[PDB]
Design an enzyme around this catalytic site. Sequence first.
Site, short mmCIF file in Angstrom:
data_model
loop_
_atom_site.label_atom_id
_atom_site.label_comp_id
_atom_site.label_asym_id
_atom_site.label_seq_id
_atom_site.Cartn_x
_atom_site.Cartn_y
_atom_site.Cartn_z
N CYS B 118 39.82 -42.28 -9.61
CA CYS B 118 38.43 -42.69 -9.87
C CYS B 118 38.00 -44.00 -9.21
O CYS B 118 38.57 -45.07 -9.47
CB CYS B 118 38.16 -42.78 -11.38
SG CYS B 118 36.41 -43.05 -11.82
N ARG B 121 35.83 -46.95 -11.66
CA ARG B 121 36.47 -47.57 -12.83
C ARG B 121 35.98 -48.97 -13.21
O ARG B 121 36.38 -49.49 -14.24
CB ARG B 121 37.99 -47.58 -12.65
CG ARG B 121 38.62 -46.22 -12.91
CD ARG B 121 40.12 -46.24 -12.65
NE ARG B 121 40.42 -46.17 -11.23
CZ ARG B 121 41.62 -46.41 -10.71
NH1 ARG B 121 42.63 -46.74 -11.50
NH2 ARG B 121 41.81 -46.30 -9.40
N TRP B 290 28.05 -40.85 -13.41
CA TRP B 290 26.96 -40.58 -12.48
C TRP B 290 27.60 -40.32 -11.13
O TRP B 290 28.74 -40.72 -10.89
CB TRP B 290 25.94 -41.74 -12.45
CG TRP B 290 26.48 -43.13 -12.20
CD1 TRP B 290 26.88 -43.65 -11.00
CD2 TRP B 290 26.66 -44.16 -13.17
NE1 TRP B 290 27.31 -44.96 -11.17
CE2 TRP B 290 27.18 -45.29 -12.50
CE3 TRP B 290 26.43 -44.24 -14.55
CZ2 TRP B 290 27.48 -46.49 -13.16
CZ3 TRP B 290 26.73 -45.42 -15.21
CH2 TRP B 290 27.25 -46.53 -14.51
N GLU B 295 29.68 -37.24 -2.91
CA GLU B 295 30.20 -36.08 -3.65
C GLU B 295 29.25 -34.89 -3.42
O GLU B 295 29.70 -33.76 -3.24
CB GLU B 295 30.28 -36.38 -5.16
CG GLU B 295 31.34 -37.43 -5.56
CD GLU B 295 31.39 -37.66 -7.08
OE1 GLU B 295 30.83 -38.68 -7.56
OE2 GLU B 295 31.98 -36.82 -7.79
C1 HEM Z 1 30.29 -44.38 -13.87
C2 HEM Z 1 30.31 -43.49 -12.85
C3 HEM Z 1 31.43 -42.94 -12.20
C4 HEM Z 1 31.53 -42.76 -10.86
C5 HEM Z 1 30.56 -43.30 -9.81
C6 HEM Z 1 32.80 -42.09 -10.58
C7 HEM Z 1 33.18 -41.59 -9.29
C8 HEM Z 1 34.28 -40.75 -9.08
C9 HEM Z 1 34.53 -40.04 -7.85
C10 HEM Z 1 33.75 -40.10 -6.55
C11 HEM Z 1 35.61 -39.26 -8.06
C12 HEM Z 1 36.13 -38.21 -7.05
C13 HEM Z 1 35.65 -36.84 -7.52
C14 HEM Z 1 35.99 -35.72 -6.55
O1 HEM Z 1 36.24 -36.01 -5.36
O2 HEM Z 1 35.99 -34.55 -6.99
C15 HEM Z 1 36.06 -39.50 -9.42
C16 HEM Z 1 37.19 -38.93 -9.99
C17 HEM Z 1 37.60 -39.13 -11.31
N1 HEM Z 1 36.92 -39.93 -12.25
FE1 HEM Z 1 35.32 -41.06 -11.98
N2 HEM Z 1 33.51 -41.88 -11.76
C18 HEM Z 1 32.65 -42.39 -12.76
C19 HEM Z 1 32.85 -42.16 -14.13
C20 HEM Z 1 33.94 -41.51 -14.68
C21 HEM Z 1 34.17 -41.41 -16.09
C22 HEM Z 1 33.19 -41.86 -17.19
C23 HEM Z 1 35.42 -40.92 -16.27
C24 HEM Z 1 36.11 -40.67 -17.48
C25 HEM Z 1 35.83 -41.19 -18.71
C26 HEM Z 1 35.92 -40.67 -14.94
C27 HEM Z 1 37.15 -40.06 -14.68
C28 HEM Z 1 37.62 -39.71 -13.42
C29 HEM Z 1 38.76 -38.86 -13.20
C30 HEM Z 1 39.81 -38.49 -14.24
C31 HEM Z 1 38.74 -38.48 -11.90
C32 HEM Z 1 39.68 -37.49 -11.19
C33 HEM Z 1 39.22 -36.07 -11.48
C34 HEM Z 1 40.02 -35.02 -10.72
O3 HEM Z 1 41.25 -35.21 -10.57
O4 HEM Z 1 39.42 -34.02 -10.28
N3 HEM Z 1 35.02 -41.06 -13.96
N4 HEM Z 1 35.21 -40.41 -10.07
#
Ligand code: HEM
Lengths: 416, 414
Positions: B118, B121, B290, B295
């Site tokens: 992520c 974070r 968001w 993406e």
């Molecule tokens: C606040 C806005 C957030 C943004 C801008 C963000 C952005 C991202 C991006 C770009 C990815 C890559 C996704 C992909 O390539 O499929 C990602 C993965 C991830 N994010 Fe975040 N994230 C945010 C919030 C969250 C939240 C709230 C959580 C959990 C409480 C979270 C948990 C994760 C996890 C676990 C992954 C990996 C998912 C996977 O393995 O497919 N994210 N995030």
Amino acid sequence: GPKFPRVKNWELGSITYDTLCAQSQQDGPCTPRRCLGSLVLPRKLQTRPSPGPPPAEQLLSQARDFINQYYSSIKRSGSQAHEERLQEVEAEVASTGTYHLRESELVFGAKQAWRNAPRCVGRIQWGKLQVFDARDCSSAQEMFTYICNHIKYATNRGNLRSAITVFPQRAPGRGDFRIWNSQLVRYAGYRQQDGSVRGDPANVEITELCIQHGWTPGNGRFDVLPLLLQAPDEAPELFVLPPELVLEVPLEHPTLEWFAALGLRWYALPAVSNMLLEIGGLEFSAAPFSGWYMSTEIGTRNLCDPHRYNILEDVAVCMDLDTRTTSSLWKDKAAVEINLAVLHSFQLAKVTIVDHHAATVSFMKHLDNEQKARGGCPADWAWIVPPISGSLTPVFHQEMVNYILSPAFRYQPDPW
Amino acid sequence: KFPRVKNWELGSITYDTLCAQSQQDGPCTPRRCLGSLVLPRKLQTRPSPGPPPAEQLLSQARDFINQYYSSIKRSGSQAHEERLQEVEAEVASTGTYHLRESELVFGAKQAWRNAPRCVGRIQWGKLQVFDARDCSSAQEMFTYICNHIKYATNRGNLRSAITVFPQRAPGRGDFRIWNSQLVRYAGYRQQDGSVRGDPANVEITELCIQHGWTPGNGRFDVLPLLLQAPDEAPELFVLPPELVLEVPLEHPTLEWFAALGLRWYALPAVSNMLLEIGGLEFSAAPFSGWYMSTEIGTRNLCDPHRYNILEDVAVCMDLDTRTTSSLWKDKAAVEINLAVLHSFQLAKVTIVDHHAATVSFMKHLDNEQKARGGCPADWAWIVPPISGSLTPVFHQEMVNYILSPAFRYQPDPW
Ligand code: HEM
Ligand code: HEM
Ligand SMILES: C[C@@H](O)[C@@H](O)[C@H]1CNc2nc(N)[nH]c(=O)c2N1
Ligand SMILES: C[C@@H](O)[C@@H](O)[C@H]1CNc2nc(N)[nH]c(=O)c2N1
Ligand SMILES: [Zn+2]
């Protein structure tokens, strides 16, 4: 299923198993605990200077493995010539502490090393490499002649040809042959009073080293550095490359007429000269190799990295983009046009170059060929995927397994 | 043993001492690196028909409780010891235990914080946690989900949120959301073998019709949710159009772009992952934040195995698609990402471009280096799918490892 790494391509949904990694006899940075795969210089391969002769037995097992690889490549494994060569190498190591490679063995190993390089996306060409034997070289002056011949042959007036020149191997109780410069062609980097740098920041140290050795510096952004060649147990000697040998390309843009007025340019021949070639335990400290550029190397990394020429902002201002805000994607737009300029200029100047799309597609073909030929292909994902338009190329969607196979090209400590 | 991590743009160096806390193993080994792999070979989470080993669970539980009480600075206090005895007492008699709402909230945040893939974070501390552990039917799950969507969407001013359904229990089916995300466009495999809509969602789309849903024939048809209560066939629930906010895509200068009829939803909510806290597993815990523009603009719309609209845009832009060197692909891609950002900003819907996102991530790494002595990160996922080296993260070495609490992948229910 099978007991080997399962590798998937997410675009085509295809699955393969890498069985080649099983033959990796050297370890890397990773452990079940954590993945140190993004580190550029993890302290494993790192061929740190090991002066005192190597363990007679360790050299042996490494030499035996290479000879076996050689006889296998010629389909004579287990034959009489094979067992005799093995007896010869051992006899030689037993009396002198080292051994020497036959001509054909050197050629084979040089190609294998390239073939085995995890970070090279141009490996579809691995079988086509001109191998110049220079193991008779006895002076820094001679080193300079060999190198000039290499540049002449490789450049070939724009129709570039891959090549490598192999200088004498590291000898017990004798200094190494070393080429101090990281590449045969490098632009000077001048440390200004106001802290900045004129030229290429990457070459600041080597530029200051050439000066300490008698080089009279210039003051441009694109001044070609001289070579600091080092014969055994001697201080490095300075040599200036004849301008006519160093082919350069002035950059212009297909439609943005003002791009040419920027006075940007780059040299045609990419030739790495600070890496160590390891074959069957023998170490070739000086063995410069060269191929041709992939456009993103020049247009994105060399010209746009913040710690290199950093021309992104200047080019964006000329394109009249909103550089005050990230959401305008001004960095993206400028980068695209700059990469296009590099491609356009090279094609116009009839100099060999390959864009990141063609290159990666060809690398996918290479992976397929190697899957059949060796059951896998060591690859460093972060280095194979281009610095721009990553997921627009096929390699991004291809899972990759990284591991060290010998023969190989390894990093080595700077002679200074 | 302590990874010497370096940043090549600045020359700065740091040592990751946090990886030493990692008790869970990854796929890598000293002989070969498999970090570029998306899903594990089996690191997953095998079945849960029987109770997890008491010593094992008790160890993860005590560690987690230790973590929570450090977070509130009451470590070693009386409450801390009485909580440990509670947990040990419960596990010894039932083979499991339960978390207090406060602990759960703490665990959900640490899971996000520890997520190696992520890039957003930096927002880890701001997460609305909905406790849905008092859920007993697919129907209840649906209501909870609809409230999550309403809250998270917030008329375009997106707010990060997570809803946590009942933990898994030995010898009992799992609560599961079959859909990979709460909002997904259908993928209808048309005769030719090709696909109308989102190819990534061909399977789930099939399962929905198979369970009674009457499909449409569009490229952007919002799918229904297949919610599953323990040991029960999943049920079909259609999401109310008003709840599913969508953004029409148009370009700031190219007038024909809007004609393409492209659009994308506002809320990215993953719903197929498992949340693990102190040994307890939550098989249904949908979370959302968001979108980062790439993406949608780069992956969802331009991936060859997704909407793959790259060529269409190029032809409309009147580019030389005959050869790769004209960089027609890179050009169209930039305009598509520009359209996404323009459109989202115009519809007053939260979005972040990859440049802003990675700058924030760099700060986060900084904050974490001082806070925990390191930060697990997966370079391949952190670096954007376009303009990689144009962002700060590309030049930053990273260490990847598994910390708990953690979000993990899990088998598909069917
Ligand atoms: C606040 C806005 C957030 C943004 C801008 C963000 C952005 C991202 C991006 C770009 C990815 C890559 C996704 C992909 O390539 O499929 C990602 C993965 C991830 N994010 Fe975040 N994230 C945010 C919030 C969250 C939240 C709230 C959580 C959990 C409480 C979270 C948990 C994760 C996890 C676990 C992954 C990996 C998912 C996977 O393995 O497919 N994210 N995030
Ligand atoms: C024929 C054209 C070739 C192309 C287009 C090509 C392209 C590439 C590219 C894009 C890189 C990455 C450069 C960087 O980011 O630092 C690279 C790395 C590398 N290439 Fe190739 N290559 C070719 C020929 C060669 C040859 C002839 C050899 C050796 C005999 C070779 C050996 C290597 C090695 C060892 C690396 C890794 C260097 C490092 O770790 O810094 N390549 N190549
Ligand atoms: C952090 C480290 O993995 C990153 O700077 C690497 C990634 N990709 C990459 N790729 C190529 N071709 N060349 C490089 O120098 C780098 N640098
Ligand atoms: C092959 C696999 O490692 C690659 O497709 C990964 C790499 N980066 C990446 N990064 C993000 N953010 N999301 C992804 O799905 C992927 N896919
Ligand atoms: Zn690894």
